[PDB]
Design a protein around this ligand. Structure first.
Ligand SMILES: Cc1c(C(=O)C2=C(O)CCCC2=O)ccc2c1n(Cc1ccccc1)c(=O)n2C
Ligand SMILES: Cc1c(C(=O)C2=C(O)CCCC2=O)ccc2c1n(Cc1ccccc1)c(=O)n2C
Ligand SMILES: [Co+2]
Ligand SMILES: [Co+2]
Lengths: 381, 381
């Protein structure tokens, strides 16, 4: 059931911002590992004496990488006179974030009709404000509120290229990499207690629980009116035999934060061949593949949807497959993006629920827990 | 003239350590951009609850990338009980370094016969101690003293694979990249005043001035007995028309520190083709090429040494060429390795001074200042 109860008009995911110590090296690593192009920059070369920010793009997916310069470069400035292109940036806030969490997402940004309004209603409805609405070059409006831990939900709205004060990147320096990733599908939070986190976020957004159908976690998914903005949240399950990975996240991250980004590919086979090609030459590693007993049970579950040639292709690439009642999903998970066992990336492709494709089509793969356990026990014997 | 006056026996450059906020992303970027292989690791997977350290290797070149984990992982440990593989590491020291300087070299490490002795004599001879000598697993000894700014000279000696507590890297995860780089040739410091820096370092090492033959800098080179360890130092020249890059380093780095690493290639043409191939797909950019007026004057200067086919090859790759009285050098410079206009890398190849090749053969390219000015003025007209 979809109550369509957003308290303000929410369009789509707009970008994801990583807070870094060196934005250049993370950016060039993500670019190659994921096949994202260098699109825009705000840095010393553009008159930004405060922070270096580099934007990567694939399809509609926007990854922003930001690090602080020495505060001494802008010691003479004040907020009215700043050269920061993102006015919410704070040197001390950024340094404390990276040193507390390591590499991680600072902002999940969603486009909205009216950012100042979305901020006002949000804060009226329980949101802890993080950065008040600011109007950039009479063109774009930006506002921030707390989401969980040190992660903010960022509202951006346009009266009528990324943000003012960014420059488009030198096409000689900008190589058109592309491995098929097109857009952000969901962004997932880890918290110590799911109940109060859900109440708070649903409280100020109007987002509703997105319905779906003894290991790991309890989770629930918050969704906008058209279920195109999707913000799941996990909490750990204590007491089990095997330690909760959610609980391992919270230990190494020093508390709650963004756990994974799910990136939709238009061709999850091309994407996964291209990323796997580069795993050991600067790219990303993937979680261990499931045992062929898995793929030996996929015919009896999705053989309707995928040909035996296409299941074998899942087998070589290590792709996992789950099924809702309206659609099917193909998914795989990278190893953690940095030093700590915290944030990782998910690649997904959704098949079904054509009307455009409705959001969440197929769910989020919580069935793959049961099938992997079954598979593992099958393969053992 | 070579007084051969080292106060302790110095062998060769052993490794260079970068202090990072995320060692994984810097490491994977350097690996691809430079063609260095993943050799050893010390991290959570090896029982190191303190820091993540990843070693890249090309030839005899060792690049170590280290970042701190959350201090809460080792809150219960004490120095006697630490799980750090590098006992000199300090969480607070590392965080303060990265936040003061951004990405940069923390340690220039040289092998020596006796590390405890090298430390004792050094400190007896004016060296500010930084980490006392420590004996790792009865096998290796490690000691540190201050070099300049927050950079330390690290002594390592072996009684008889990198360091104890590192593991050799999974050969599946370890791809044999190689673009021809073989060893570290020199490591160069920027300081505000060259005189006191030279007096101090030469003071406790016994290193001697290495002789050579209105823009930029004043520099001088300290060298070991066999001139295989080479530690030049720059200071800025104020008052010029155009700002000193040395002075720009000191502003953005928040003081003195390591300015560039010169890496010897056995084939500077293969190396530069392979790095240039990857400049815009995650690798390194290079300083702007000199104008062809440069290469139109190289026949009259090194035509003895390089064929007209080989000068044209310099022309496509942007290689610079200088000449001492004993040998010739080919050199080029990358753009800064990270966000700040601070550290960069130099690729070099030396031709001449065969006896093995003596160190510094050809010098360090200070003649290319004059020739570039001449060239620029030539091309203008
Ligand atoms: C991350 C993930 C998902 C996933 O994305 C997902 C959502 O999007 C929202 C709803 C709930 C959910 O589970 C699905 C299946 C998975 C999986 N992981 C990695 C893993 C498991 C446990 C704790 C930390 C990390 C795994 O092994 N399987 C088999
Ligand atoms: C770094 C460098 C060197 C070089 O390596 C070198 C040493 O190894 C030790 C002795 C002195 C020395 O100069 C040679 C020529 C260069 C050069 N640079 C970049 C640059 C210039 C000015 C201030 C910052 C950076 C440039 O443009 N030319 C033409
Ligand atoms: Co997911
Ligand atoms: Co040099």
């Amino acid at each position: 059931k979809n109550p369509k109860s957003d308290k303000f008009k929410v369009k789509r995911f707009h970008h994801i911002e990583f807070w870094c110590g060196d934005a250049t090296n993370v950016a060039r690593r993500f670019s190659w590992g994921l096949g994202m192009r260098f699109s825009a920059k705000s840095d010393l070369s553009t008159g930004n004496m405060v922070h270096a920010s580099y934007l990567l793009t694939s399809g509609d997916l926007r990854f922003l990488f930001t690090a602080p310069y020495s505060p001494s470069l802008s010691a003479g400035e004040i907020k009215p006179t700043t050269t920061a292109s993102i006015p919410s940036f704070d040197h001390g806030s950024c340094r404390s974030f990276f040193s507390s969490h390591g590499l991680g997402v600072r902002a999940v940004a969603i486009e909205v009709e009216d950012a100042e309004s979305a901020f006002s209603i949000s804060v009226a409805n329980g949101a802890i404000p993080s950065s008040p609405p600011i109007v950039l070059n009479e063109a774009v409006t930006i506002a921030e509120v707390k989401l969980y831990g040190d992660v903010v939900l960022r509202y951006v709205s346009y009266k009528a290229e990324f943000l003012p004060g960014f420059e488009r990147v030198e096409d000689a320096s900008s190589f058109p990499l592309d491995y098929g990733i097109r857009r952000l599908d969901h962004a997932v939070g880890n918290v110590p207690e799911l109940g109060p986190a859900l109440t708070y976020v649903a409280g100020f957004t109007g987002f509703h629980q997105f319905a779906e159908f003894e290991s790991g976690l309890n989770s629930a998914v918050l969704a906008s009116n058209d279920e195109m903005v999707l913000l799941p949240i996990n909490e750990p399950v204590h007491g089990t035999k095997r330690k909760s990975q959610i609980q391992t996240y919270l230990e190494h991250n020093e508390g709650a934060g963004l756990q994974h980004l799910a990136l939709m590919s238009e061709d999850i086979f091309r994407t996964l061949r291209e990323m796997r090609k580069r795993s050991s030459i600067g790219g990303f590693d993937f979680m261990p593949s499931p045992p062929p007993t898995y793929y030996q049970n996929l015919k009896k579950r999705v053989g309707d949807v995928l040909s035996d040639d296409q299941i074998k292709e899942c087998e070589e690439l290590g792709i996992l497959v789950d099924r809702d009642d309206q659609g099917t999903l193909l998914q795989i998970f990278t190893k953690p993006l940095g030093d700590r066992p915290t944030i990782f990336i998910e690649i997904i492709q959704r098949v079904g629920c054509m009307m455009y494709q409705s959001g969440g089509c197929g769910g989020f793969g919580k069935g793959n827990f049961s099938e992997l356990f079954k598979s593992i026990e099958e393969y053992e014997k």
